[model samples]
Target chain A: EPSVQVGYSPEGSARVLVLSAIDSAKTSIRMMAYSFTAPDIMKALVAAKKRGVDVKIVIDERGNTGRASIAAMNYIANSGIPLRTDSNFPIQHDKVIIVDNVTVETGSFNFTKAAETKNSENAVVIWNMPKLAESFLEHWQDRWNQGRDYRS
Target chain B: EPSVQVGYSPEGSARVLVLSAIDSAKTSIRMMAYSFTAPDIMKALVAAKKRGVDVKIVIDERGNTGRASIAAMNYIANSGIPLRTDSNFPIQHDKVIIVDNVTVETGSFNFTKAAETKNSENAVVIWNMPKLAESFLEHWQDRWNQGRDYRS
Candidate 1:
């Protein structure tokens, strides 16, 4: 493990600015969240797809119970971004975002407004952190192997 | 939260003793473990049920992917203690055990041989610690609500 520095940012435009960076990914964006139901984030993903970014998502299979995530995933799939569920076994408790294989967004931010606003949330956006990003990607790949295809 | 102390026995005999204590529960015995495939431990649970103890288990739904853990759950379920999986969710990663609503045996012990043998493990046997026991029981109840009917 490299030296890990943890910080906290209270609710503010900082959150929106981070989301904006997430929206700006050009090559690819990958996420492994317990749930991914936020509308603005969803819109951002769709917008990124429209701009030709390869967006792939691996959500916790348990969160797909109500099929709401399935519906959202279907919408993303329609945009040609591949989406899948992590292995149906271990709960994929990770919340992560990988951008261009260089930056990683991770912390307690579940893809929900509560996490974004009401609840205190911490997110780390690491730039030039290829090693950490690679570690996250390796974990994502491990979970991706267990993911099953869902067409909606 | 009551004051708690955790102890580790390097001889591995303490784990067997823990199983025996779990085996002796009268009113109810609740357990949640990531892995628990020990034969002697399974026998202890089966023996508890034979002695008329209310033995219930919630195993990680991830199943044999976390092979040893699921195997122990399968063994107990086969032996007659009602066993269930956290339906449609990632395997419950919490490790806990509640006995008689009075004492709790909890810690990082997955009740595995390695946890007893090679890997260092700890167990906090909180004697007469009802407050902490109830907290763990609440979590156990939440997990039970998420589980399907006992597959036994």
Candidate 2:
């Protein structure tokens, strides 16, 4: 059976939910986002990779043009994590985190300070949903195949 | 216990999730979006309103200035769906749909053709979560109160 958990930000549930999901990953963690600027999320991903989880990320090419995104990319680069940018697409606008191929965290929630405390955001954590996770994984692979390696 | 449904686009799972959620609204529909340009989503909201679902929308003022967003706003205005624009905030950057005070649909998924077919997006349908729904409702109301009625 699948279970759902919902979170809203500006109150911080969205951030909490995403961080918890990333912390719980056992085998692999794959992610896609238009923007990647939240320090907490960035730290969580780095920590997960250090703990031996195969962590990979795909970010929008244009989104990397931002100062915050550039800094984030540089940080991830230093951490030895594999990160890519989707250049063929106009905007790789998905915000998703798939954990261990069994759980997924996604939503209109961007990982940013504004998203966490200034702007309204929503996210969902879906547990025990392999099929759903696989669908997102397929999407991730498609983007990853076309994405260029991050250079910082 | 609540069930979850996930969707992606270019293949259109995100759009389907939103349309299906809107179509299922029994009492009311409260939405907040940074952008509104997808015809399918606009049509579904209109249809829901026609069926007596209290459909209310809050869109980012800047987002509505886009060509596609302007058209969507016109369509909603023509249908009398009580649309408003968030002017005080830098961006009312949330994509959410609360149905019948029981289910909430949200994500980084904007309601746009680009979001549906060109850009990668994510959304979640959370069922049987009134407390969560209420939180979103409160967020919606805060924006709704500060928003101005659509003039065009």
Candidate 3:
């Protein structure tokens, strides 16, 4: 049973939705993506940290060399959020967000203006998307370990 | 060699991105999605239609039966934009949008709030990613024909 819902990928509405979910996080936020850039979004993650939610991020190592991705990781790291990246994979193209095992977001829209503001992008945000979110978290853990070895 | 840039994928940013792209279209807009539902996006599409941009949409047949996807298709149809869907594929999971062939957007984000707002989404808007975009457009045309013959 596919639970269907609609939302646009630009004009920054999707960022607002992710913030809402982040606001609801009482435990943790786990994410994996190809890129990351949204100032307000970083602020929200910092706030989530202040609220005592564990926040961790994993980015594709192949794509994380840019100044923006590096700066984003630094900010999260400064806030005491754990960050990692894939080192061996040709492309870790998975885009996902999981919050406290209650919600899951997956799709193609990378977190950037190029993706959200100017390009025609598509994505899905599922509330209580069953095992989908958990599966993402599990996958993140495995990749995190692999990333550690590859980077080391 | 892949270019590096800063990006973000929080949750609902897809709506913001897609609508902005559609609003920016000066020549033509072509889209393909498995599912989509975002009124503001449709409104933008209508506005583009009024502005005389040749807007065309290709949605999956499975999408036609979903409550939200149908509503969106109906709105696009009502706007005098040609709406289409495909039938002969395992899953028409290819989601993309091409604007003027100069700008191309593709990724995991679907045109819906769940994809755009509250879920983790990612997309890339290439200023000149047309080589890739053209490849996607070519695939879209082929699948669009397959879908035309398989619809209910």
Candidate 4:
């Protein structure tokens, strides 16, 4: 069934909803991040890569080094998963994950502890919407095309 | 007809899509904004009020004074639209607008010029989805309940 699932942070857990969506990636995971410092989310993405799923990511460069995101970024970059920092915008501010090309996780929820438990955020995971996925994928690639390969 | 519409920034014009959704509100517009400074969007909401729509808002306090958002926030507040600044969280970062309790607009898209043209933003508009709207409304009030009335 085509589904639109939404979650708010703090009283609820947007991270848990994000984890579930990443866990459901059967074939591929294309993602964009502005502030991705969640260890569990990083682990889940790496685990998906270990499961032979294609996981490609493009993150904004601003927080790629200064923030707590470097370790996970290096983990993904050195693990042979494709990673890059898209510096095309003032801030590449999309928090998105397209799972298996059919599901999309998006909204203002950044993958970070502050966003999960201390900040108010909105997250939505839409399932079985290939067309919507197509559009997100298009924008994802639009971002991907602007990425400068990151190696660390 | 149920619709799931998506838009990217600058190239695809997420701002335009956002304005269109606010343009469609028939009864009410309940919103939670973290950094709202888009002039056109503020104008649209005021226009909705002029059309007899009940427009209410909850914005984050940090950006409410520091960013370009104060003018618009005050405009809405003085225009007799219900408005407040939510300081319950470290950052009230929900970029959401629920229209007439039937359509929802949420994403990483902030209502600022930087977000519209210089940030990689994502926006989704789900139409004819009352259940989804209910959940968003619930979360919206969750933020609203924590709001402090703003008079400036």
Docking class of 1: incorrect
Best model per lDDT = 4
Against the hidden true structure, what lDDT does model 4 obtain? 0.88
The residue pairs in collision within model 1 are: B35-B69, B36-B69
lDDT of 4 at A105: 94
Task: List, residue by residue over A108-139, the lDDT tens digit for candidate 1.
Answer: 45665555654333444555556656755766
- Model 2: residue A60 alpha-carbon error in angstroms: 1.2
lDDT of 3 by residue, B4-29 (tens): 11122343444566666777788888
Please write out the lDDT profile of model 4 over residues B1-152, one tens digit for every residue: 66788888876568888988999999999999998788888889999999999998999988778646778887787778989898878899999999999899999999887888877898999998999999999999888888998865
Candidate with the greatest TM-score versus the true structure: 4
Better candidate by lDDT, 1 or 4 = 4
Ordered from best to worst lDDT, the candidate numbers read 4, 2, 3, 1
Report the lDDT tens digits of candidate 2 across residue range B69-88: 88899999999899999877
Per-candidate DockQ vs. reference? 0.03, 0.63, 0.08, 0.91
- How much RMSD separates candidate 2 from the native structure? 2.3
Quality class of the docking in candidate 4, CAPRI style: high
RMSD of each: 13.0, 2.3, 16.0, 1.3
Over A14-125, each residue of candidate 2 has an lDDT whose tens digit, in order, gives 7898899999988899999888898888999999999999999988898778888888889997899999988777788888899999888887788788888877677778
What lDDT would each prediction earn against the true structure? 0.63, 0.85, 0.63, 0.88
* Residue clash pairs of candidate 2: A107-B107, A107-B108, A108-B107, A108-B108
Stretches off by above 4 angstroms in model 3 are A1-5, A149-152, B1-152
Q: Please write out the lDDT profile of model 4 over residues A30-141, one tens digit for every residue.
A: 9999987888888899999998899999999877775478877887788788998988788899999999998999999998878888888989999999999998999999
